[PDB]
Design a protein around this ligand. Structure first.
Ligand SMILES: CCC1=C(C)/C(=C/C2=NC(=C\c3[nH]c(/C=C4\NC(=O)[C@H](C)[C@H]4CC)c(C)c3CCC(=O)O)/C(CCC(=O)O)=C2C)NC1=O
Ligand SMILES: CCC1=C(C)/C(=C/C2=NC(=C\c3[nH]c(/C=C4\NC(=O)[C@H](C)[C@H]4CC)c(C)c3CCC(=O)O)/C(CCC(=O)O)=C2C)NC1=O
Ligand SMILES: CCC1=C(C)/C(=C/C2=NC(=C\c3[nH]c(/C=C4\NC(=O)[C@H](C)[C@H]4CC)c(C)c3CCC(=O)O)/C(CCC(=O)O)=C2C)NC1=O
Ligand SMILES: CCC1=C(C)/C(=C/C2=NC(=C\c3[nH]c(/C=C4\NC(=O)[C@H](C)[C@H]4CC)c(C)c3CCC(=O)O)/C(CCC(=O)O)=C2C)NC1=O
Ligand SMILES: CCC1=C(C)/C(=C/C2=NC(=C\c3[nH]c(/C=C4\NC(=O)[C@H](C)[C@H]4CC)c(C)c3CCC(=O)O)/C(CCC(=O)O)=C2C)NC1=O
Ligand SMILES: CCC1=C(C)/C(=C/C2=NC(=C\c3[nH]c(/C=C4\NC(=O)[C@H](C)[C@H]4CC)c(C)c3CCC(=O)O)/C(CCC(=O)O)=C2C)NC1=O
Ligand SMILES: CCC1=C(C)/C(=C/C2=NC(=C\c3[nH]c(/C=C4\NC(=O)[C@H](C)[C@H]4CC)c(C)c3CCC(=O)O)/C(CCC(=O)O)=C2C)NC1=O
Ligand SMILES: CCC1=C(C)/C(=C/C2=NC(=C\c3[nH]c(/C=C4\NC(=O)[C@H](C)[C@H]4CC)c(C)c3CCC(=O)O)/C(CCC(=O)O)=C2C)NC1=O
Ligand SMILES: CCC1=C(C)/C(=C/C2=NC(=C\c3[nH]c(/C=C4\NC(=O)[C@H](C)[C@H]4CC)c(C)c3CCC(=O)O)/C(CCC(=O)O)=C2C)NC1=O
Ligand SMILES: CCC1=C(C)/C(=C/C2=NC(=C\c3[nH]c(/C=C4\NC(=O)[C@H](C)[C@H]4CC)c(C)c3CCC(=O)O)/C(CCC(=O)O)=C2C)NC1=O
Lengths: 147, 160, 159, 159, 159, 159, 160, 160, 159, 159
């Protein structure tokens, strides 16, 4: 991203844009199923939904890193997010507590390596020092990966 | 949704193809689309001046901009400017689509509950949108002005 | 192309760009030729669908084999109706300029559908490729480039 | 018919026969109607070629099958160009009255050629038969007998 | 099934709860019947692949048909080798007591593999159903139930 | 504008949607007019910096005044060099078709730079406005519109 | 980066204006963009057929898909198809950009580290990318197949 | 390893005899060995001139040779000349072998560890190897300069 | 032979001395004869192992005798497979021009392997001598000399 | 080149490997061309020293200048005697086929000798380059290549 809003620099510029140097972000807009007020609901095209499915694609793309195989998409949380109740951060939380995420990034690796890699995926930045590290590792020692 | 995609969706619910009635609707949409493009340019020219003239005509020197009003605070005044800037921009989008359903789905989904919960007055917003309608009708022209005013009045009726 | 431009300028906070207004102007200028291509494809519905389906059965005899899905008169009639549906969506996409009518009517969930129907995806795709070849032979040359590139989107999106 | 009569009287030592001069007189008398038939076939070049080629692909889907020769837009464009060439030679033969222009431009070595190109001869012949049927439907009745009999020479000489 | 309970109690910070110890003790008790079932399916493999190919090619003849994938001796040998692979993974799942070491090698990415090989997945599911029927004829009732368990998992997985 | 669509479709796992291909084809078509506009602004640079310094120092005389930053020949030469830099970045943005390679070099950190240099940013915005006026006088109507596009972006950016 | 963005950068780091050689480079790019777009469209048509034909040419019926090979397990076969689809897709992006920097930035960055960590055979990957290049050069024609093979050989050379 | 030894190894680990593709590879190597030997001779001619021209192109009159830079001390300048002579010499060995494995085995093994331990700037090293590549591609010709630049870019890519 | 000169000049800090470049150029010249000799030994592998087993089991019958190692069909098949391995390594050494890639795979630890397998090494040396005699009968004089070179190296190595 | 292979195989306990025997046989074959090249450089020595002094003193006039070493007739005679010595060692290296008997007499300690004589080594390298150019003009193409080989070694050695 832009240099000037380094988090060490501007603790007042954390919710800013990523600019054009950073990767492109995804906001869930135009939630499908809200089609006006007046009675209708018999359309075909409904251009909003084709743009909402791509947010669901990018969520797998950033938490898992790749696209998931066809037999392992989480269809329940997919249609629950499309319905309108579960939100994007709720979908990321329910995705990172799946069995595939556990058997890919918690089961084959060391505890501290898996904690650091989960910080690379979810928060999107490496952990600063030890101040975060047997903090999240102290949390891992009482309730586990879910905590 | 455009006017084109609305025509296609209506024919698709019927299950038939695009014969002469739908084709004549599409020819009508193309003929108005030329002046719609020209109006989009002349609206994107001076959107800031349009919002400035609208708030100077309607909202300034009243009780809501005085201490004890909804537009007193500096962040509240900036939110007012950005909301009127939105109404102009989305009325431009709904003008170019020739179809107000994208405008409805975009802002009239939740702006009623948002202005309910925040305590924002509705009628002052309706007056401000009407002032935007007068300023854009004076700036652009007659028929493109009323084409803009159709969707601006759609916004003002959706908020009420 | 108006819906896609509007939602793309909707994701940003700004208006429609001069570039995008040039895109809409060029789309309006080419719209009459696109209506001519839609006129030809509407009026050639029968023989295009039949030639494409029979080219498919020449290439892929597995579907009309008795172990296959399209075994029998009724099943092969539904096969030709599927090809009719896809040619109709191709005409919609040629008229609109977007592929959002093709997508949200016939692309977006077709893999799971044809998995549950027992129908192979690749034979659908080969039939739409046969439609592309037939409509390419019917139309004018760079007009056929225009029609066959929407056909190309349908073919690449089915697989 | 003048060249053939002259070379036939050249093989003998004698002049042109009264019978042959009657043949030349009757050919001159029918020449204006033959120019009318050439006028109609010149002006109907597009749709005759396209209808004949699409009738061929309705009859024979092997060429536009992916194992076939005419697979793809460019190959099928050359297919339609071959049908265009043969319709042009048919118009030349209708005008001349001989089949020596048809022969020494497009008949005499075509078997070895289409053997080396990998193209089947019988599908060419079926396409020229489709041209015969289309030009028979366009023209007047015994005028279509005249046009279709030169088409018949091309069809029988290709096989 | 021990790795299942271990990673299950390992995601939590708790130990293995003694109900899980009860299920491990019960699996340890049933391991002898599991080993006998696996050896009975082991020594009789070529009969099962023969009868599975029998029932499949009687059920779906399109793999036999030249448009299908399993056409010719080499392709049909690869087909019966695939059925041999799936019988081997079923014996692994019979010993392990839980479907993890069979899904890890045969299920988890099979749809895109068979899609980019051209073969239909429903014919593979019918082949594993034929394997289940032949092993149901080969075993006793309480053995065929416990084999049709994991065969049923594979049939549900390939669909 | 190609990097914009590429990283735009790259954040998604999807390909480039063919509406983006249409906008790339339209930009490819308009590139010749873009190149002529950029060359016309290229060869006439010193006129534009002269008239921009003219209109700026007529508009704001405090940079001329000794309390301001651009006092003396060296500081006023640095001032016109800054205006030369911004004209150069405007030509880059005219060629690239989208404001990324001009914002990356002139916009993204300009406020803190000009704050720690002592100069006001509003005078720089008035200088780019004077550049826009002089280039509007230099070009034709459809060229001045498309130049005042990117000049307008710089004027909005410096404020 | 682009070829346009690379030309602009090379003119920028000198402080140079756009001289005639850079305009020649941009006009050559604007000439070649036609076949660039057409090639990208027909490669996006049938990418799965290209990957299927490439593994049927190079990797299938070897010892690699036999037990003991690296493509024996079915998750490893799916990972192989994924890696080949990645190579073809990023080669399409580098072909349409006209600059191989996105291959260096997104594919070839830490790839030999990964392939030597997992024990992935490198020479079989190079031969698979070669078979990809032959199949798409046959499918797209020679004139765009040259530019496709340039970036696929770039991936193959950086991998080795 | 060689290209010959790599071909023999790839034929050996399968238990395969020398088929016609391996004989094609060996005959291509026996065709290219002429210019390989001539290029190695003229690079062994004036290696010191190449290193001198490369530091005069890239590293000299920068801040790197100024105090504070990594080439300020004269033992560090001598170590810089030594490292560049190493890169050129091992690139000559990899060019004459026709296989970059000796670069992976003898140069690129633990080199990023050393350069991050000592605080050696990596980007300036990459630009110095680039200037080496340009100078020797000018000196040897384009036809052998391609193969020299392949292994020098291999060193540059593994270093980064 | 290029790796030999490269590590030879690499232990020194000097470059490759141009006499080594002369020997590399001469090996590059002789590579075509090397490739023909290797292909001639390649295609006639079955014959050479047969005649080597012939001459060996005529020479030393103790491997045939039940106290020896190569008793029975399985052990004699392993014996001829060992001779096949050594012929393969001889072809590798013929192509490489120097005995490094054959000593690295067949010589460097062979004595302790054959000692802990029970087989005598002198019988293996007689088998490679029989291979040398059969290849001397198979090739021309200048080819048999250059093959008996590397065969001679193996015979000296196994002793 | 025979001493090179002999001490090369002598550090090892192995004999001379027959690839080394091949390179000795090839050098034995090329020895006649080596002897003719050496005699052609032998009989024309004073021309080569004259043209080398020509091209050197045209290239570097500081040896002519009184601050340089080769100032005056005695010092310039010693300079041309040094060039005569290096031409003699080049003929020795041409006969021997490998650069050992020329490096042993002219290279191995030359830098400290010329440093403690005051002369620069780069001027000596330019003198041997002038000798290489004059011998390239004196010989044919395949002879000048093989002479410029060892001349190139001396030029690389003096630097
Ligand atoms: C608290 C200790 C601390 C430091 C120092 C720090 C430095 C730091 N300097 C950076 C960039 C930079 N740093 C410099 C600085 C310099 N280049 C020069 O030519 C000058 C010699 C020198 C300025 C005196 C520049 C020019 C960049 C820009 C590189 C770029 O972003 O493209 C970056 C990359 C991302 C960013 O700025 O936002 C970091 C992290 N971070 C820290 O946490
Ligand atoms: C599951 C395998 C596993 C282990 C073992 C592990 C160990 C581990 N022990 C740590 C600290 C520590 N480890 C010890 C342990 C010891 N020091 C001693 O004197 C004793 C010899 C020994 C105890 C028997 C101590 C005293 C610290 C505290 C250092 C500190 O935090 O300041 C830390 C630093 C952060 C933190 O505790 O929260 C880790 C990651 N992490 C793992 O994932
Ligand atoms: C507009 C978008 C759209 C599509 C695509 C569509 C397909 C569609 N195909 C169907 C059946 C079918 N579709 C096929 C298709 C094929 N035979 C093959 O092997 C070929 C690969 C393929 C021809 C392309 C067959 C054989 C059936 C009958 C299967 C059955 O009856 O179980 C059915 C169920 C019966 C029906 O309602 O007609 C639907 C809904 N419906 C839609 O609304
Ligand atoms: C005036 C006399 C005349 C004829 C007849 C003629 C034919 C002709 N057909 C060609 C190709 C072709 N011709 C066909 C033909 C067919 N597809 C089929 O399956 C059908 C049976 C047939 C349509 C009638 C095809 C598919 C090709 C392309 C083959 C290739 O490119 O290899 C070519 C080579 C490419 C070219 O120059 O166009 C020639 C010269 N040229 C002549 O000068
Ligand atoms: C143990 C895990 C595992 C699986 C699942 C597996 C599948 C597998 N099936 C293959 C081929 C094949 N698979 C089939 C399959 C079938 N015949 C049909 O008609 C039915 C649809 C189905 C079986 C009844 C066919 C026909 C081929 C050859 C296809 C070709 O050559 O393109 C191949 C490529 C050739 C090979 O290397 O064997 C693989 C890797 N390999 C594995 O290691
Ligand atoms: C291409 C991107 C780019 C920008 C934007 C840029 C700005 C820039 N402006 C500078 C100075 C300056 N800039 C100005 C600016 C102005 N005169 C005024 O009164 C107005 C406020 C404004 C222009 C009309 C002045 C007066 C100085 C000299 C200030 C000083 O010496 O302290 C300097 C320091 C001196 C130098 O090295 O040139 C930089 C780096 N440099 C860049 O490379
Ligand atoms: C966009 C650039 C890019 C690439 C290429 C990439 C590759 C990549 N390939 C992987 C595994 C793999 N990669 C391969 C691929 C191959 N092995 C072979 O035998 C063949 C030679 C070759 C296929 C042509 C296989 C078989 C695995 C499976 C290893 C395993 O997961 O157990 C992994 C480990 C985790 C995972 O797949 O999900 C990564 C990260 N990541 C990237 O971001
Ligand atoms: C054959 C492969 C190989 C390499 C490359 C190698 C490098 C190497 N470079 C070193 C130091 C060094 N290397 C450099 C080189 C550089 N610093 C810069 O600023 C430039 C960017 C770059 C020169 C182009 C310098 C300046 C030092 C001195 C550090 C010191 O000794 O204080 C050292 C520390 C000890 C010593 O030189 O004697 C090693 C081992 N060893 C190897 O075996
Ligand atoms: C390419 C390098 C290479 C060598 C040299 C090699 C030798 C080799 N010889 C073996 C056995 C054998 N080797 C022989 C050898 C002989 N018959 C005799 O009487 C003679 C003494 C001699 C050959 C004429 C016999 C009889 C066995 C079977 C011995 C046993 O089963 O214990 C075995 C164990 C069985 C096997 O896995 O093949 C190895 C590994 N393997 C290799 O991969
Ligand atoms: C065969 C091996 C061999 C070498 C290499 C050799 C060099 C050699 N060069 C000498 C002098 C010299 N060498 C030169 C050399 C040069 N003139 C220049 O300007 C150039 C730098 C260069 C030649 C073009 C000069 C000028 C002197 C006289 C220097 C003096 O008198 O101090 C001397 C001392 C006087 C003598 O006894 O000849 C020796 C021994 N002698 C040998 O036996």
């Amino acid at each position: 991203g832009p240099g000037i809003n380094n988090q060490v620099s501007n603790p007042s510029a954390r919710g800013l844009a990523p600019g054009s140097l950073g990767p492109k972000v995804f906001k869930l807009d135009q939630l499908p199923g809200t089609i006006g007020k007046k009675a209708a609901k018999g359309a075909s095209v409904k251009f909003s939904e084709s743009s909402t499915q791509a947010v669901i694609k990018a969520t797998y793309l950033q938490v898992f890193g790749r696209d998931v195989y066809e037999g392992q998409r989480l269809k329940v949380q997919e249609i629950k997010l499309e319905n309108g109740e579960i939100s994007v951060r709720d979908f990321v939380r329910a995705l990172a507590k799946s069995d595939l995420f556990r058997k890919l990034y918690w089961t084959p690796f060391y505890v501290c390596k898996a904690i650091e890699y989960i910080h690379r995926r979810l928060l999107g930045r490496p952990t600063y020092g030890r101040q975060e590290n047997n903090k999240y590792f102290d949390i891992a020692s009482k309730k586990g990966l879910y905590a | 949704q455009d006017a084109i995609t609305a025509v296609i969706n209506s024919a698709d619910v019927q299950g038939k193809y695009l014969d002469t009635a739908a084709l004549e609707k599409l020819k009508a949409y193309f003929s108005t689309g030329e002046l719609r493009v020209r109006a989009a340019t002349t609206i994107s020219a001076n959107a800031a001046a349009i919002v400035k003239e609208a708030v100077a005509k309607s909202l300034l020197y009243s009780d809501i901009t005085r201490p004890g009003g909804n537009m007193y605070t500096t962040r509240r005044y900036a939110a007012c400017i950005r909301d009127l800037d939105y109404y102009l921009r989305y009325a431009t989008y709904a003008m170019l689509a020739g179809d107000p359903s994208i405008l409805d789905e975009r802002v009239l989904n939740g702006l009623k509950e948002t202005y309910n919960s925040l305590g924002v007055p509705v009628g002052a917003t309706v007056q401000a949108i009407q002032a935007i309608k007068e300023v854009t009708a004076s700036l652009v022209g007659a028929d493109a002005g009323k084409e803009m005013g159709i969707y601006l009045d759609y916004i003002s009726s959706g908020l009420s | 192309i108006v819906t896609k431009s509007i939602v793309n300028a909707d994701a940003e906070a700004r208006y429609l760009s001069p570039g995008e207004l040039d895109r809409i102007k060029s789309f309006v200028a080419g719209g009459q030729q696109r209506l001519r291509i839609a006129q030809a494809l509407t009026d050639n519905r029968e023989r295009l669908v039949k030639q494409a389906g029979d080219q498919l059965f020449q290439k892929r005899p597995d579907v009309v084999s008795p172990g296959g899905n399209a075994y029998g008169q009724e099943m092969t009639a539904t096969c030709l109706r599927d090809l009719d549906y896809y040619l109709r969506l191709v005409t919609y996409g040629i008229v609109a300029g977007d592929v959002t009518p093709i997508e949200e009517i016939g692309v977006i969930g077709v893999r799971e559908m044809y998995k549950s129907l027992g129908t192979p995806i690749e034979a659908v795709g080969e039939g739409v490729r046969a439609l592309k070849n037939a409509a390419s032979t019917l139309l004018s040359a760079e007009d056929a480039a225009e029609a066959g590139s929407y056909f190309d989107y349908v073919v690449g999106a089915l697989q």
